Ligand binder design. Structure first.
Ligand SMILES: *[C@@H]1O[C@H](CO)[C@@H](O)[C@H](O)[C@H]1NC(C)=O
Length: 307
């Protein structure tokens, strides 16, 4: 009978997060007498995973009598934090029991899905033809390999920068990406999309969206005119506030620098591009000024004179 050998037939095992991992180990001899123990890591600070003779290991279960020679284990509910190299080790009986021979080790790698991509646009709004940044973020996947793409309404974008961290080794990875997007006057109904592809994903990439309606500001055009009034000594003066977004607009009517009336747009019409239209009118050497404050921005105004 040849001397006891500890045999770990698998150099590496790959498990999906949440599943059970099987770590195989068989010993060739029953002598010398002593327990088999499982560890993660070797040398300094190795972690006891299972002890055949005593203790509680709820996650550990035996995969196989006194002539038992198979010491394979199963570990339930795997997480990325279980990744590492596992060693099956034979000890000689004693108090305490001394180490005798170690298996060659089995590397356990764990597969985790990326989290749903979160897309954030800038803090303040911008007008058409401005460039704005969007950030995309996804965490906790392994392996490190991943693919990130950006789209604006279906067209893939190219102007972006991506980072995966750690650059070094870890159990889970994160991805962070920033894309530069040029706003047009048609973006109220537009959407920016960040999609990630990973092996743990059954064909369909995870997507994160951001609606440009939250980011765009389209300033109103003003137009002040005068209408025929039946009664004499009266003129209908109108201000048309057209094609604006969002719908937050305050309008003050002025008479030679004197506040005649203030108003908030309440019932607007909508255009095909998602912007709104509104109009205010009042019955009146004299100047009339239609003064507008759109979405908390600096007042703009058109002035008009009396017949
Ligand atoms: C002033 O003109 C507007 C725009 O045509 C109209 O809707 C409004 O009713 C007019 N005011 C009066 C008193 O007719």
């Amino acid at each position: 009978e040849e001397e006891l050998q500890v045999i770990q037939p698998d150099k590496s095992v790959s498990v999906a997060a949440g599943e059970s991992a099987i770590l195989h180990c068989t010993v060739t001899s029953l002598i010398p007498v002593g327990p088999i123990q499982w560890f993660r890591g070797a040398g300094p600070a190795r972690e006891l995973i299972y002890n055949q003779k005593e203790g509680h290991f709820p996650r550990v279960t035996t995969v196989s009598k006194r002539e038992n020679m198979d010491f394979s284990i199963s570990i339930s509910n795997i997480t990325p934090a279980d990744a590492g190299t596992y060693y099956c080790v034979k000890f000689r009986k004693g108090s305490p029991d001394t180490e005798f021979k170690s298996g060659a080790g089995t590397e356990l790698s764990v597969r985790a899905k990326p989290s749903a991509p979160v897309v954030s646009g800038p803090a303040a709004r911008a007008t058409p033809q401005h460039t704005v940044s969007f950030t995309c973020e996804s965490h906790g996947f392994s392996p490190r390999d991943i693919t990130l793409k950006w789209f604006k309404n279906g067209n893939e974008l190219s102007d972006f920068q991506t980072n995966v961290d750690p650059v070094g080794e870890s159990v889970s990875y994160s991805i962070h990406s920033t894309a530069k997007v040029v706003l047009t006057r048609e973006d109220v109904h537009s959407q920016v999309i960040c999609e990630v592809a990973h092996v743990t994903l059954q064909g369909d990439p995870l997507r994160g969206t951001a609606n440009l309606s939250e980011t765009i500001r389209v300033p109103p055009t003003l137009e002040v005119t005068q209408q025929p009034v039946r009664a004499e000594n009266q003129v209908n003066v109108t201000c048309q506030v057209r094609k604006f977004y969002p719908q937050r607009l305050q309008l003050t009517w002025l008479e030679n620098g004197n506040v005649s009336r203030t108003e908030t747009a309440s019932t607007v019409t909508e255009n095909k591009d998602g912007t709104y239209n509104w109009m205010s009118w009042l019955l009146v050497d004299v100047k009339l000024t239609c003064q507008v404050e759109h979405d908390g921005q600096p007042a703009v105004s058109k002035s008009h004179d009396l017949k």
